[PDB]
Amino acid sequence: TCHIRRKPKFRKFKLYHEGKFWCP
């Protein structure tokens, strides 16, 4: 599922260890 208010952008580490959810 993909539901986010602020899509991922301008980030260094991808899929880091912070909340399992990567899909706006």
* Interatomic CA distance for residues 6 and 12, integer angstroms: 16
Can you spell out the DSSP letters for the chain?
Answer: ----SS---S-SSSS-SSSS----
User: Method of determination?
Assistant: NMR
Give residue for tokens 């952008």: 9
Q: How many CA atoms lie within 13 A of 4 on its CB side?
A: 12
Residue type, 21: F
Give residue numbers after which the chain breaks (C–N above 2.5 Å): none
Give residue for tokens 């580490």: 13
The CA angle 9-10-12, to the nearest 5 degrees, is 110
Beta-carbon contacts of residue 8 (< 8 Å; ≥ 6 apart): 22, 24
CA of 7: how far to CAs of 11, 13, in Å?
A: 11, 15
